[PDB]
Amino acid sequence: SMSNRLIFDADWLVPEQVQVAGQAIQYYAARNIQYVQHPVAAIQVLNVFVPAAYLHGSSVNGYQRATAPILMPNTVGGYLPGPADDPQRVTWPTNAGTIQQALKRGYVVVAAGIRGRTTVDKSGQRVGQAPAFIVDMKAAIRYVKYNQGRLPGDANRIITNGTSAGGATSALAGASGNSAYFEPALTALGAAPATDDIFAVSAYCPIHNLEHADMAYEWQFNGINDWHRYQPVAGTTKNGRPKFEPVSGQLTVEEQALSLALKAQFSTYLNQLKLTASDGTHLTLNEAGMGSFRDVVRQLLISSAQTAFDQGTDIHKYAGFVVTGNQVTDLDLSAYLKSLTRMKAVPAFDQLDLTSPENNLFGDATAKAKHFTALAQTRSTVTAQLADAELIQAINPLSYLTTTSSQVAKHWRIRHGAADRDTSFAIPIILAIMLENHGYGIDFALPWDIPHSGDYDLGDLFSWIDGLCQ
């Protein structure tokens, strides 16, 4: 209610400790903070964790109470709700280990709970479909910035972090700072009267650009007709984590037809982005999906392999690499992809029968799921509506990056594993190249033999943050 003044009080902070790694890391915690005045769901609270030194007037890793970075990780995956995280959390989903390491590194951590597509309100109505996830993330950032003077950490050094749909959430927060689109939603929640632009983005395998992801996926995987992925199993886990088992299928003839069409469409979409190489050349694909853009994808995979080769990894786990002396000199990209295998069927994101996580993300209180592409609406196998075009644009980080803007975070670190088939490699590459081309700081790689996952390179992520902030 209006009684909630959204004022942080450091007297709320209580002392705790956690092991990392062989050592007791001391910090203070304030949990279950209602970060808006009119929440519609119990999940909309945030936790604050502060290195102990900052309540005792001292320093950690070059930082102090006034100056520490504020890491804002989220636990969103699959566009599902993401509970507020905690270094003590053992319940799934959690990146508690990352928070423990972040505190040791001197970062203030503000971990906000985020609605997602299955969230319902007290009356059982859905209230977490798009754009709830990003509205909540923004409302948490606003809480932090509004409380700059009271909350330890520098609110001008907010760095979001997330994996998968949570990586899209982090990227979207960095891309969409202070966008008017979201203001009515934020006003209706009674979010704090502050800005929501942030300093830097960390994103692992961001599942974004949804309305073009089907095109990209078939550009990458057309010609591969079997798909292999995972499905939940029964049993009850001590920590609530889901357990999985493999499952596969073969594309139907309908799917093969759509696949070849979606692949062709990708070239038209890609070329019109006007992506440019470092020499100024337009990165393009021809009608067959071949060209300088494909050469960039290949070179990033060769670079991934070279880094691994140099460490004594056997890169011939996968097919296609040409090694000459000590150098990975080329790559048969089709062979590599056949050995990696296709994960998703067709379309991979906007399913014709509205059964994907992304379909459900684009539902609303009336419609459980919607299409978000013209192709899937036209070819729908169930009665269905298309989501509003403005909403689809508003939740795509690329919509904001057609220019050099100062609402956009200046610094980006994006990773997508070279063994990650949850979206085409083209999707994070497009994001990275657009950022580069518009003058933003972008540190990008496809780490070797990494699956769909995040937070596996914290030493390097933290060195990047410290390079920006110390």
Sequence length of the chain is: 470
Q: Which residues are annotated as a binding site for 3,4-dihydroxybenzoate?
A: 78, 165, 344, 358, 422, 452
Report which of 300, 325, 297, 302 is spatially closest to residue 315, judged by C-alpha positions.
302
Q: Show the tokens assigned to 103.
A: 């505190």
- Give 3-state DSSP helix, strand, coil % of the chain, rounded to 5: 35, 20, 45
- Cα angle 341, 349, 273; round to 5: 95
The domain 1-470 is placed in CATH, from the list 3.40.50.620, 1.25.40.10, 3.40.50.1820, 3.30.230.10, at 3.40.50.1820
Report which of 399, 406, 367, 361 is spatially closest to residue 384, judged by C-alpha positions.
367
To the nearest 10 degrees (0 to 180), the angle between helices 426-437 and 253-272 is 10
**Cis bond upstream, residue 83 (ω within 30):** no
Q: Show the tokens assigned to 219.
A: 């550009």
**Domain assignments of the chain as residue spans, ordered by start:** 1-470
- Cα angle 385, 391, 392; round to 5: 75
Task: Report the DSSP beta bridge partners of residue 16.
Answer: 27
Alpha helices in 252-355 (DSSP H): 253-272, 292-310, 333-340
Report which of 271, 264, 272, 268 is spatially closest to residue 222, judged by C-alpha positions.
264
Label residue 195 exposed, middle or buried (CB < 10 Å: 0-12, 13-18, 19+).
middle
Q: Which residues are annotated as a binding site?
A: 78, 165, 344, 358, 422, 452
Distance separating alpha carbons of residues 268 and 286, to the nearest angstrom: 9
Distance separating alpha carbons of residues 234 and 236, to the nearest angstrom: 7
**Cis bond upstream, residue 428 (ω within 30):** no
Q: How far is the first Cα of the chain from the last one, in angstroms, to the nearest whole number?
A: 39
- Cα angle 167, 172, 177; round to 5: 140
Instruction: State which amino acid sits at residue 329.
Output: T
Pairing assessment for the beta strands 24-34 and 14-19 based on DSSP bridges: antiparallel
Question: What residues have CB less than 8 Å from 391, skipping those under 6 apart?
Answer: 130, 131, 362
Distance separating alpha carbons of residues 146 and 141, to the nearest angstrom: 8
Question: What residues have CB less than 8 Å from 213, skipping those under 6 apart?
Answer: 207, 348, 349, 423, 424, 427
Q: Show the tokens assigned to 70.
A: 């504020």
Which experimental approach was used here?
Answer: X-ray
